[PDB]
Amino acid sequence: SDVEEIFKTTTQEVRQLLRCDRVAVYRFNPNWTGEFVAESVAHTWVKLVGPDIKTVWEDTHLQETQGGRYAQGENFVVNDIYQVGHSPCHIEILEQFEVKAYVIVPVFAGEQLWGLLAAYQNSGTRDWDESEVTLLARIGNQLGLALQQTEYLQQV
Numbered sequence: 001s002d003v004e005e006i007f008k009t010t011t012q013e014v015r016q017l018l019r020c021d022r023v024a025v026y027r028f029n030p031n032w033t034g035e036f037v038a039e040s041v042a043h044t045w046v047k048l049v050g051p052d053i054k055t056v057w058e059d060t061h062l063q064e065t066q067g068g069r070y071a072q073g074e075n076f077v078v079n080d081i082y083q084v085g086h087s088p089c090h091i092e093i094l095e096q097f098e099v100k101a102y103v104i105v106p107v108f109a110g111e112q113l114w115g116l117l118a119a120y121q122n123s124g125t126r127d128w129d130e131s132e133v134t135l136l137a138r139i140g141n142q143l144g145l146a147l148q149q150t151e152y153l154q155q156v
């Protein structure tokens, strides 16, 4: 799968586009277990996707709801995870990644929702601007097209 290389080089660019620290690719497996296939993070932090690589995130919330609002292709922007009035758990994990805000856009590739595209930036208690959110989703879907193209070519 050389297409991953294409993702690697682009994920680093979109990372700078939204002035983010790290940008993760979250794929939905047949069991919706939450597999991270790749992430572009500054060398100043832990890469995460290195020792184990397979970073699973079993979010029973999104699993039971089959993606929830994300299933309808709706994006979500969190300017701050605390101020939003969120419930316990999920937040504890995010705080550990040195992040307090993020943006989630849906990436469709193939027949269903392939995965989500999230970008985080050193806490970042700022407002996610329209210019950033809409471009992130655009590139996300754009990358999914490369997945389709490669699947069409059937790289063997």
Ligand SMILES: *[C@@H](C)[C@H]1/C(=C/c2[nH]c(/C=C3N=C(/C=C4\NC(=O)C(CC)=C4C)C(C)=C\3CCC(=O)O)c(CCC(=O)O)c2C)NC(=O)[C@@H]1C
Residues within 6 Å of the ligand: 024, 026, 034, 057, 058, 059, 060, 061, 062, 067, 068, 069, 076, 086, 087, 088, 089, 090, 091, 093, 102, 104, 116, 118
């Ligand atoms: C402990 C209680 C378990 C848990 C519960 C829980 N989750 C949510 C809400 C959300 N879960 C996600 C999932 C993700 N966010 C990411 O950045 C990633 C990596 C890409 C994943 C997998 C999301 C986005 C939400 C918010 C959107 C939504 O609600 O659909 C809640 C509600 C309160 C909250 O939003 O924090 C609860 C109670 N979460 C876990 O991770 C534990 C398994």
